[PDB]
Ligand SMILES: O=C(O)c1c(Sc2ccccc2)c2cc(Cl)ccc2n1Cc1ccccc1
């Protein structure tokens with residue numbers, strides 16, 4: 001079904017839509033001379049220095065929300081290039097985005113993570129995992145599930161060209177709640193799955209059942225989203241003067 | 257290693273037959289009505305007579321009685337799944353702590369997978385095919401019980417649209433059990449080595465058993481996302497039912513509190 005051209009089309013659109021690729025993320029993280037070293041936020045003192053180079057825990061959590069809004073915009077731009085996506089019923093285009101966007105944010109956040117922390121500000125900073133664990137409850141563990149996923153996910157050693165197809169497979173899920181026309185979505189995903197299987201065969205010939213192992217990770221992705229909405233509710237129960245961005249309000253209402 | 261992937265599939269199907277008395281083929285021969293015939297539980301009157309007619313190990317307000325009956329049966333299911341697990345080549349040679357971990361986290365997923373075999377859009381087979389409880393009758397139960405089975409009916413309708421048979425499911429259940437991502441595993445290596453052979457066996461099985469069915473392997477694997485979700489929301493529903501229901505023997509409590 002011209003699976004190689006489709007693989008490449010997706011990869012090009014992914015490079016067009018997302019400003020920080022995994023290749024660049026890894027080059028920054030491992031001190032390559034193609035890129036610049038990051039400023040490191042590891043405690044309250046360096047955070048305050050990082051923000052220039054009321055409560056800090058709420059302010060970090062809010063920063064993450066805002067970068068997530070830009071991330072939703074990038075995802076949506078990417079999704080328009082997925083062949084067939086813009087031809088679907090408009091309500092279905094909304095539904096697929098509403099349910100897929102966090103699973104994609106988390107997939108792609110793995111690209112910015114190692115076991116010790118996460119790239120921030122398109123890779124200009126690096127915030128440590130230990131600093132994030134040190135924040136006030138309930139904010140001291142909101143990133144832990146994402147780190148634990150990133151470590152496992154990153155062991156698959158996927159590259160940008162593998163990830164572009166994988167993210168498209170995620171968006172085109174005909175099992176999302178409240179879809180009107182399931183069949184045209186499954187037809188699209190069928191092609192994307194074929195392209196993914198072929199991409200992994202060619203790109204990882206020595207890697208047994210990599211296709212299967214990647215699809216199984218979709219399970220972890222969904223549980224992160226599930227846990228995250230549980231955490232949001234705990235924050236709603238226990239926190240007061242706390243504002244949520246309109247775009248995120250729409251996504252979360254009423255997700256799971 | 258095609259011939260032995262086929263032997264593995266045949267071996268697993270044979271053990272599945274041995275371990276699970278009510279199979280999908282049998283459940284389907286009842287649900288489509290292909291002939292015994294089930295006693296129907298469509299309302300409170302029929303429930304009452306059903307309890308007198310069918311055996312029931314559970315024979316308290318109705319919604320409670322049903323939910324405890326379900327738990328009692330789930331505990332029975334765990335021992336069938338455990339027996340089956342022990343027939344998966346390599347499983348009984350794993351570190352004992354790891355066997356326990358795989359079963360602890362795997363049984364729930366397997367219970368819901370196999371419950372789909374007993375279900376259609378209209379209701380569920382109960383007591384070994386001897387009964388049938390309507391989906392509508394479950395919805396009518398008072399909150400929080402009216403909403404408890406609905407997500408499972410949702411899952412089953414999407415899962416059953418794959419049209420898997422017992423031979424497919426035998427290998428799929430094994431794949432579920434041998435997951436190297438369960439927390440607290442000591443030795444992930446042999447677990448993933450077994451799962452790898454099982455995945456290869458499953459891939460071939462689906463290709464041969466469903467030649468006209470594109471990306472069925474992939475679609476089945478992605479069904480695991482909705483499965484885990486069902487399980488997570490079920491456990492939190494139990495951990496609200498428990499904390500809030502007064503109708504829920506100390507000795508019996510000990511047996512049935514966990515799966
Ligand atoms: O602005 C950012 O790039 C950023 C932020 S914003 C921020 C970071 C440090 C100090 C203040 C704000 C962020 C926060 C967390 Cl807890 C985790 C990851 C974060 N990132 C990186 C990120 C990348 C993709 C999607 C969301 C966030």
Ligand SMILES: O=C(O)c1c(Sc2ccccc2)c2cc(Cl)ccc2n1Cc1ccccc1
Nearest residue numbers: 321322325326329330333380381382383384389
């Ligand atoms: O005892 C049973 O066979 C049964 C029960 S027990 C029961 C059924 C109807 C009325 C009273 C008790 C059950 C209950 C729900 Cl709400 C759903 C499925 C159920 N089943 C069928 C079942 C099969 C496998 C695993 C769990 C349950």
